[PDB]
Amino acid sequence: PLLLKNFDRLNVRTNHYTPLPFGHSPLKRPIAEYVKAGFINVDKPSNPSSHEVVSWIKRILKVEKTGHSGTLDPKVTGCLIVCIDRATRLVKSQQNAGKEYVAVFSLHSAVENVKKVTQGLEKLRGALFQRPPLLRVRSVYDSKLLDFDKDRNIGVFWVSCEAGSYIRTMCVHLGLMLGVGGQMIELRRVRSGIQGEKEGMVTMHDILDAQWAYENHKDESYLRRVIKPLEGLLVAHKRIFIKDSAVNAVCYGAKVLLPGILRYEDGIEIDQEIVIVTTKGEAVALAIALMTTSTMASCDHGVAAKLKRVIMERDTYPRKWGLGPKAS
Amino acid sequence: DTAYWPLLLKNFDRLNVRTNHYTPLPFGHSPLKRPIAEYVKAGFINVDKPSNPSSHEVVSWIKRILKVEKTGHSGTLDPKVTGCLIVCIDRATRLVKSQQNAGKEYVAVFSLHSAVENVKKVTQGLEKLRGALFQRPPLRQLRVRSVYDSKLLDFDKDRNIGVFWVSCEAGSYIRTMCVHLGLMLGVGGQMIELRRVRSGIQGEKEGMVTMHDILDAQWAYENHKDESYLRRVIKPLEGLLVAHKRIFIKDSAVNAVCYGAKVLLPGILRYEDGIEIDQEIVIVTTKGEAVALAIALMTTSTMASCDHGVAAKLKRVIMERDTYPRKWGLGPKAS
Amino acid sequence: SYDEKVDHCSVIAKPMAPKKLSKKIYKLIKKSTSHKNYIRNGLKIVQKQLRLGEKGIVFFAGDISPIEIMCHLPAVCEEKDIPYCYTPSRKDIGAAMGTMRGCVMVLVKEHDDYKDLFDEVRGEIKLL
Amino acid sequence: MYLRYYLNENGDRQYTLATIDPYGKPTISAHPARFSPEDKYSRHRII
Amino acid sequence: PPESVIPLGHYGWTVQDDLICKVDIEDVPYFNAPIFLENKEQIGKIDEIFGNLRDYFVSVKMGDNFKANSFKDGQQFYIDPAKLLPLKRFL
Amino acid sequence: ESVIPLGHYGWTVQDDLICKVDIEDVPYFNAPIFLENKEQIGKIDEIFGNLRDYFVSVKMGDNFKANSFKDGQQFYIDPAKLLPLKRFLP
Amino acid sequence: MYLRYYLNENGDRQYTLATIDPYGKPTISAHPARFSPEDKYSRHRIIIKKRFGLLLTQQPE
RNA sequence: CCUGCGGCGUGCACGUCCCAACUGGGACGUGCACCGGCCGCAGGAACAGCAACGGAGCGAGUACUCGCUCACACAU
Known part of the structure; x- marks a missing residue:
């Protein structure tokens, strides 16, 4: 679901890891963090501009920051991706979307x-x-x-x-x-991109009704239908699963290192944009691959990928670097 | 499950593992994901030969179409004979001789x-x-x-x-x-x-293309700046060495091998079981690039049970020099 | 029959004439054969005339293989605004051109003798 | 307006300018309703 | 005024008050760039450049006592050699 | 000068007189053949067949006819116009 | 020319001199089209080939 | 010592004409391909090192620069 789909089809480097009680599943986040880490597939009306159709959403949702991944002309309708708060980190990566x-x-x-x-x-x-x-x-x-x-x-x-x-x-x-x-x-x-009219398109009336239902009834069903997790914008990216002990290092700027890769996907080439994913399906960061999949199947250490844009916030997982087998 | 991996990585997991310890270098590309210039320069074409022309004419026509410095062919088909014709492009030309004995x-x-x-x-x-x-x-001999x-x-x-x-x-x-x-x-x-x-291992079903296909692919690449057609036409030279036993080498030994160094044991990552003495093998990188063709001087058991000694002797260096950095001479024993 | 014969044709055998249009085309070629320079037969002659700028209606044979010998000429005709249409077989074209030997494709020019039919057929194709 | 559409068995948008679809049912307009921020009819629409 | 002139390309067709020229020289012309004749006679100004990156066309808005029916098939058009860019630049 | 037995008559493909070979030496091209009485009947035209059990087709002069020889007719060849078999072996 | 073929179920070429295959369809010529190095019909060939879904880029694998 | 590189009038295609298929013939012009050993040049003389001192998160100016904070992480 979202990013664990066909996880058994991936190449398993190791199964042994110590699960931690931290973190949340992408689709089971609280309502206060669902919105912050979500995007909306808005069916833009005819007349208003895209920056004003995004300002409307920001005002409606009472969110601190909101962006979009492609400017639609004032007289042009169609798909419009509106990223909410923590998802705005992906806007740049979304410019080249077909x-x-x-x-x-x-x-x-x-x-x-x-x-x-x-x-x-x-x-x-x-x-x-x-x-x-x-x-x-x-x-x-x-x-x-x-x-x-x-x-x-x-x-x-x-x-x-x-x-x-x-x-x-x-x-x-x-x-x-x-x-x-x-x-x-x-x-x-x-x-x-990978989002179309069948893929959960919601009218601006739908967003208004959802925010209204949330305010006057404290029901998050409609808002969760309206807002989707940001992991749905990286489903076309190739994945490199890392262990629970390596997520925070990546969140602090550390490069992805081979000893912490739990699973990697066939078809990773050098200088390729990949998505770092936790074992629960969250998106730790977007990285640039410095090793082909074969080079990772055949090595015991090194830098599997360098960071391009960290998505997860710092301190989401505990600091657990420096406690490895050596700790020397 | 590496049985589906392209070209020289097939059954990569089934290969005997000598060591897992090395530092990969960022130089080089996968055979199928090369840039277009290098892909063309290190490629070959399975061409349905047209009935009328000669093989040398076909090779020269491909040269003019693809604008490549060098090109060759293994077997010569008479002017009036059609069928398979493997044409190498600028760097698979070093493998023309090895294809001369093909069935x-x-x-x-x-x-x-x-x-x-x-x-x-x-x-x-x-x-x-x-x-x-x-x-x-x-x-008339x-x-x-x-x-x-x-x-x-x-x-x-x-x-x-x-x-x-x-x-x-x-x-x-x-x-x-x-x-x-x-x-x-x-x-x-x-x-x-x-x-x-x-x-050889190339036939009518193995991705044979016509000369019109080559010309059309060149036009699509030079007018629409599209590469898919040229990539269906030209195939990596590693497709010609898929029947060879493989010896994977560390990235620190690639440039040495290019300069002429013999494939020494301390720089072998993996090898294919069944290698006998005086057998033609392909020395490959971990990215899947065939660095060279060598002649084995060690059996599989010897390669598993030894710590030093020359593993293979160079026969044909395929990789271009300075593709990888010079890393020979910095190890413990070397100094 | 005809449905089977059209079945044997290649997938690029479009636009295709129906049976009635097929009889009309055979009549047109047979009438045009009487004039030496007003009918062009063969691949090379038709291609050369298209290159020079000659006009008319071009009739292809849909049962040809390999298609790379003629697959490009439909686009040339499209480019120069020359109507063209496929026919079920090459043997039929040959039989309609007074030569048992088949002709892959043919090009018919306009002559006052058979203008009406030649423009009925043209209209019929343009409505397809 | 100009752009209308209908749906096939798979629920996919087929775009046409015709007021009647191939199956005889009317074609639905492809554009969403005009939006005004000062809209106090959320409860009525929900009902 | 034109110190030198080079053949920009050949004729295409006509679309309303515009003259499409099929460009043969790889160099991509400038915008609002006057198009001259063989005898250094400006005939119009560039309006739109369209098509693929190696076989493309350019529309000219004949302005000074120039019209579309004036020109005819196979005519060639010239341009100031200083008013071009390399094809690579845009790509 | 002298001759040695090359083999026996098989069939005739037109002028060409096909001779099966029983010796282990492969002759030359156009090497003259001669009967028992050292009478030249032609020159070698083609060499074919398996490596060991093989045949040679010989072209004759107007001096002879292919049908002129009956089944079992034996042929003689020069021992100085033969190559070693080990030469052509790998 | 002489050689012709028809494709079996597995996709292999079954070579024959006959004009009609056992299944009743015509037999495809074994030989490729002649090539002229000065062939100016690449564009005209990709439009039609794409139009009918036969170009190599449109095939699987 | 190893490696890489170089040397030791027929057909084909196109264009134009005569005649008698997805054709074979001719004539007139273009291009394209053909009828193991020795020598020269250059590179290196190779036992294959490197389990962190340049990354991340913010704000401003014109892909770069200017400041702040966080860590400088091989993931038991």
């Missing part, structure tokens, strides 16, 4: 067949030049003309694109290529 | 001048040409080459034309085999077509 939009385009003139539009979308694929709207290279992985109305000359196409892509510029370029011109009259982000 | 499976079409009694006659004639046969090059198996896959009597599949040793000329089969049947015969169906 996006998926569904755009509506109106053409100034008419085309002979839907095949013309399909071919035009076909040639607007791969790495493409984009200029921010009123020169960079950004990749369109896929596209698909979902619908087209000739009388209205307005069509719907779903596009998989890289973070930072301007769908306004892409629609303008689709107009230019087809010899008739065109521009975008509507946009809606349908997936943001 | 070869062909499928050949033959025509007999005059009709034969029945199909069983052709079957017996083929069953008479399976051994250390006698072969003279076509249009008569050689002896082996034909392990052979089978008459099809025979159309109306046209007197048959198709047979032959497994044979490198250098064998199947045109000579067809003329000899014609002589054997009592009517004479010749070869019409030929198609190499396997070159």
